[PDB]
C-alpha cells in the first residue's frame, strides 16, 4: 500500500500501519481498527491536554447537577460573572455545613453520577435557537471545564487532533497490540518504549506551559 | 521445542518395528496414498470405462 506525507485521517493511518507492519493479509488488516481502538483507549485513559478540553453550561436545579456522559476528569469551574472559582470537598464535609448552616465560598462533591452544591445554587442553560444567530447566555449561569473523551473514529476520513499533532503516537501504540497479535516480542518493547517516550513527551510540554509566564510563589492571603 | 517432520516421501509404511523407534520421516500408515521423491499426495482414484 501507499500513504501520503501529511498523515491526518483515519483512512490513511489504517494503511500506514499495514505499511510499517509491512504484512498485508486478511487475518491482520481486518483487525487493524480493533488495534487502533485499543491504542486510543489506552492513551486517552490517562492523557490530559488542553485541546481535548471543553466548555459547558450546567443546569443546576437545586444544589444538584447531573454529570455529563462524556466527562472524564474535572478542572476549574467558575461563574460566568465575577469569577468565584469553586472548590471540591468531601460528602462528609458538605453534609456538616448543611445542617449547621441552616459573601461565602462554594463547595461541591460527587454523588455517583450527580454533582451537589451546598448553597443550593440554581443555574440554567442558554436560551437557545429561535432565529438562532447568537447563543445568548443566561444570568445566574455557571461554566464548567472538564476533560472529555474524544469520539472513536468509526470512519475512514474522520480525523482527530492527535493525528495532527503526534500521528506517530497512535502509530507506535497500535503497533504494540499489532505485535501482540503476532508475537513480535522484540517489536513489542521497541514500539512501547518509543510509544511512552512520545506519550511522556506530552506532559512536560504542558507543565512547562501552565507555569511558563513568570514562575513565582503564592500571592493569596486572607484579608 | 520442535519436531520438524520433513521429507515425508522418503519412505512409506513399515512393520516389524516398534512404533516408538521409527524415524520422524519413517511415517507409517497409508491407504490410497502415493509417495514420490519428497512429497505426499492422494493416489489416483478408480472410475469406470466403456
Amino acid at each position: 500500500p501507499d500513504v501520503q506525507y501529511p498523515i491526518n485521517t483515519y483512512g490513511w493511518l489504517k494503511k500506514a500501519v499495514a505499511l510499517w507492519a509491512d504484512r498485508d493479509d486478511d487475518e491482520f488488516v481486518n483487525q487493524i481498527p480493533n488495534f487502533i481502538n485499543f491504542a486510543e483507549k489506552e492513551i486517552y485513559r490517562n492523557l490530559r491536554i488542553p485541546p481535548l478540553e471543553k466548555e459547558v453550561y450546567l443546569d443546576i436545579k437545586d444544589g444538584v447537577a447531573y454529570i455529563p456522559p462524556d466527562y472524564l476528569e474535572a478542572q476549574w469551574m467558575m461563574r460566568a460573572k465575577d469569577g468565584t472559582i469553586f472548590q471540591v470537598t468531601s460528602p462528609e464535609e458538605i453534609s456538616y455545613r448543611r445542617q449547621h448552616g441552616t459573601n461565602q465560598p462554594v463547595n461541591f462533591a460527587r454523588f455517583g453520577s450527580r454533582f451537589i452544591f451546598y448553597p443550593s445554587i440554581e443555574a440554567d442553560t442558554p436560551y437557545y435557537p429561535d432565529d438562532g444567530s447568537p447563543l445568548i447566555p443566561a444570568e445566574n449561569s455557571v461554566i464548567l471545564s472538564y476533560y472529555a473523551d474524544p469520539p472513536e473514529f468509526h470512519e475512514d476520513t474522520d480525523t482527530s487532533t492527535i493525528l495532527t499533532i503526534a500521528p506517530e503516537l497512535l502509530l507506535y501504540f497500535t503497533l504494540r497490540h499489532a505485535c501482540l497479535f503476532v508475537q513480535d516480542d522484540n517489536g513489542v518493547q521497541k514500539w512501547s518504549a518509543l510509544g511512552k517516550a512520545i506519550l511522556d513527551e506530552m506532559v512536560e510540554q504542558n507543565k512547562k506551559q501552565e507555569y511558563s509566564g513568570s514562575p513565582i510563589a503564592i500571592p493569596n492571603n486572607m484579608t | 521445542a520442535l519436531y520438524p517432520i520433513k521429507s515425508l516421501g522418503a519412505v512409506g509404511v513399515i512393520a516389524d518395528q516398534a512404533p516408538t523407534d521409527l524415524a520422524p520421516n519413517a511415517f507409517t500408515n497409508a491407504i490410497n496414498a502415493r509417495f514420490v521423491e519428497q512429497r505426499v499426495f492422494k493416489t489416483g482414484g478408480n472410475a469406470p470405462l466403456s
Binding site: - | 521445542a1 517432520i5 515425508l8 512404533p19 516408538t20 492422494k42
Partner: protein, 100 residues
C-alpha cells in the same frame, strides 16, 4: 495417513509429557485435508483421538491441537474430490511437561 506412537525421543526422553500446541505443515497445491490427533499414556496401545480439524490451503497455514501424552499420533485424511493437494513436510510445535 497415520503414524502411531511418536515419542519425540530425538529431542526429549520418552516418558515425559509434551504439551502439543500446533502442527505446521508445508503443503503444495489446492485441497482440503482433515487432521486428527490423539495419544495414549502407555507406548503399546493405539491412543484415543482428542480432536479433528479441516485444513484448507490458502486460508489456513497450520492447525491447532492440544495434547500432552508422551506418545502422540496424528491422522491425515483427504476425502475431498477436487483436491490435488500435496504435503512436503510438517513442523510440530510442542512443549515439555513432566513424568512420574
Amino acid at each position: 495417513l497415520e503414524r502411531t506412537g511418536i515419542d519425540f525421543d530425538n529431542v526429549t526422553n520418552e516418558w515425559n509429557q509434551k504439551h502439543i500446541n500446533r502442527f505446521r505443515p508445508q503443503t503444495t497445491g489446492s485441497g482440503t485435508y482433515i487432521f486428527e490427533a490423539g495419544g495414549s499414556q502407555f507406548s503399546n496401545e493405539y491412543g484415543h483421538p482428542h480432536t479433528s480439524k479441516t485444513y484448507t490451503i490458502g486460508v489456513d497455514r497450520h492447525v491447532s491441537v492440544r495434547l500432552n501424552h508422551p506418545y502422540l499420533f496424528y491422522n491425515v485424511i483427504d476425502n475431498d474430490v477436487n483436491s490435488n493437494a500435496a504435503i512436503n513436510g510438517l513442523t510440530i510445535e510442542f512443549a515439555v511437561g513432566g513424568r512420574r
